[PDB]
Each structure stands twice: as C-alpha cells, then as structure tokens.
Design a protein around this ligand. Structure first.
Ligand SMILES: N[C@@H](Cc1c[nH]c2ccccc12)C(=O)O
Ligand SMILES: CC(C)=CCSP(=O)(O)OP(=O)(O)O
Length: 357
C-alpha cells in the first residue's frame, strides 16, 4: 500500500487525464505507458531518497506534466519523463532512455530515422550532464501518443554546444539553420517530434531576459507578434520584470524547424519559470489565468489540474506551476502551456506537536 513513484505519478496522470477530458480507456493506456517508461524506478517507494541525479524537476521527480491550451481546442495533456532515471551512470541513463524510445517505436511504429541520425552526437561515452534523454508523450485521445525526444547539446561540454546544434540541424536536412537562431546564453535542449519529415526544436537559454529582448527573439514568420510577447513576459514575470532582466532562473526559447530544407524557424515559444517570480502557486495560477483570458481561453481546467496533482492549497507552496509558455506557429493563433510539477518529493513534514508551544 506504500506509495511508489509509479503509483504516485500514475495517480496524477489518471486524475489530470480526467480533468483534461480523456476517456477511462485512454487514461488506463497512458498510465501503463508511464509505468513502463519509468522502468524499474516505478517500483521505488517515495520514502527513499529521490534519484538526486535527475534534473527534470526541482525536487528530482523524473516526471512533469503539462497542459497546452489552443483557442477552440480541447486542452492537450503531455507527460515528460526520464526513462533512464535510477541508472548508475549518465551513459547508462541515456542507454535506458534510448531502449524505452525504441520500445515505444516497436509499439506504435513511428519513425526513428531522424533520432538515429543524431545518436553519436547526443549519446557519446563519458557524457556530461544535466541529462542524456527525456521523452515527452502527448496523451492524444485514441491511445496513440505523439512522441518527442529531448537531448543534451552540452553532452560534450558547453563549449561544444553550438557546434553540436549546428551539426544536428544539418543532419536533419535544415542546412545552416543554426545561423537563423538569435543570440542565447546556452543551448539546453535539442528535441525531435517522432511520428508518421522531422520537427526539430532548438532551445536557447536567456540569462537576465528583458521584455524588449524577448520581443526581438522571434520574427513575423514564427507565429507571435512583439506586443503579445512583451505582454506575456510582463504578466508571467510580475516583479522580476522591468528591473534589468528576469533575475531568477533564466527564460528559455524554442525555435521549430518543420519545412524540409528550411533554414528559418516556423515556430517560436517563450518559456518563463514563473515559480521563481511568485510568492505561491495562487499567484502563479492568477497570472496563468490572466494569460489564458488574454488569448481567448478558459482557465477553470488549469484550476482543476492543480487540485488533481496535490491536496495542498496553491497558496501554501510554490513550484507546482513550474513554467508558463506562449507558443507561436505560422498560420495558427498563439498557444499557452502550463508546466505542472509532480512534487513526489515535496511532502507535508510529519505532525509532532511541541508541548509546551
Ligand atoms: N526543470 C528543468 C527542465 C524543464 C522541465 N520542464 C521545462 C520546461 C521548459 C524549460 C525547461 C524545463 C528546468 O527548469 O530547466
Ligand atoms: C524544455 C522541455 C523539457 C519541455 C517544453 S517543450 P514543449 O512542451 O513546449 O514542446 P511543444 O511545442 O508543446 O511540443
């Protein structure tokens, strides 16, 4: 009866899945997919120390959830997992991550050619942190997910990051796409969409980002306009804004290459780590709700999502809403995403009353 990482994150996937409008059938399928993806660490009691060598979340839970809101669309639920979590080495973590993805490929028969083209760059021997391989599953109605793989451009050291992204973009048929990207402080992730023509995603870190610099990271042909980017920045950041740049953990951007041979991105997303810029998740939830309303969408599902993940009041803690994102793509209205923490390792400490007190 003791909670495990599997039983705990499975329960969250089920409760958030129902909040998101998924059928009992699809919820069952996806809970089994998450248990399988976690591998042996699914059986780990939550009373044991976490895998402190997983970076995926602040409390080292190897699962994070997200709800993506598009105007007129059903909310889309995603889960991010590190399948190699609990491996004794980063090299073995990557090998277990790749084994998990190949098992998903055998199940749903999506193409892995694009991934195979990149493996020598991203899974070398003696890899460097902070990750080897993450997988995100879009929990699509019908039980066949969309699959995304996240890899580490800094695997050979930060100095080799730019060259690794440039070579990855070349091998995926986007030529010198690298030179299209704005200036960044680093290259935390390269991600591939895997399905039935790969969508390549380059992530940039932006230290001390300002509203003005944020507005200049994207172009017309990427789906967001400058005033929408600045408005999102100021709503999401609250205090950290208009003070010389965001002063907590950094903003990140994503640049999507979808057209074959295209050297320019079709998509742009800005991520703000709202957890570093609020008193508590009540404040994060109010700022998220403002952003959703501003882009013509209902917020009540996001309110229900927090109650599904945890018993605690939003106002009694921070970090449940980890990031907010504004996501652009050519010929689409903006998309708003809330990244939602599992907090499997963030518990109410035991009640032992001091008397006298
Ligand atoms: N927790 C890590 C990785 C991560 C998880 N979800 C994210 C969403 C956006 C950017 C990074 C992340 C970080 O803050 O860097
Ligand atoms: C950087 C990490 C780990 C997750 C954010 S990637 P994402 O959810 O924004 O990608 P999508 O464009 O929503 O498929």
């Amino acid at each position: 009866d003791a909670s495990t990482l599997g039983s705990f994150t499975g329960g969250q996937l089920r409760r958030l899945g129902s909040v998101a409008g998924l059928s009992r059938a699809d919820v069952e399928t996806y809970a089994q997919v998450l248990t399988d993806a976690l591998g042996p660490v699914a059986q780990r009691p939550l009373s044991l120390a976490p895998p402190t060598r997983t970076f995926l979340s602040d409390d080292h839970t190897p699962v994070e959830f997200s709800l993506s809101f598009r105007p007129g669309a059903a909310p889309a639920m995603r889960v991010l997992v590190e399948p190699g979590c609990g491996a004794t080495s980063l090299a073995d973590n990557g090998r277990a991550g790749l084994e998990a993805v190949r098992t998903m490929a055998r199940r749903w028969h999506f193409t892995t050619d694009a991934l195979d083209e990149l493996l020598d760059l991203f899974l070398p021997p003696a890899p460097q942190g902070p990750l080897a391989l993450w997988c995100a599953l879009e929990l699509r109605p019908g039980g066949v997910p969309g699959v995304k793989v996240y890899l580490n451009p800094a695997v050979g050291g930060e100095e080799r990051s730019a060259a690794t992204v440039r070579e990855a973009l070349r091998r995926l048929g986007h030529h010198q796409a690298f030179d299209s990207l704005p200036q960044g402080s680093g290259y935390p992730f390269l991600a591939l969409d895997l399905g039935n023509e790969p969508r390549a995603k380059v992530y940039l870190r932006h230290d001390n980002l300002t509203a003005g610099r944020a507005a200049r990271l994207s172009r017309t042909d990427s789906g967001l306009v400058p005033t929408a980017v600045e408005g999102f920045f100021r709503t999401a950041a609250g205090p950290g804004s208009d003070a010389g740049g965001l002063d907590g953990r950094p903003a990140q951007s994503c640049h999507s290459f979808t057209d074959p041979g295209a050297e320019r991105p079709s998509g742009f997303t800005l991520y703000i780590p709202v957890r570093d810029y609020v008193r508590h998740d009540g404040e994060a939830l109010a700022r998220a709700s403002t952003v959703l309303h501003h882009h013509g969408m209902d917020a009540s599902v996001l309110h229900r999502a927090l109650a599904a993940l945890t018993e605690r009041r939003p106002e009694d803690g921070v970090g449940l809403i980890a990031y907010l994102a504004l996501a652009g793509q050519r010929d689409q209205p903006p998309r708003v995403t809330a990244y939602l923490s599992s907090e499997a390792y963030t518990v109410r400490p035991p009640v032992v009353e001091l008397v006298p007190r």
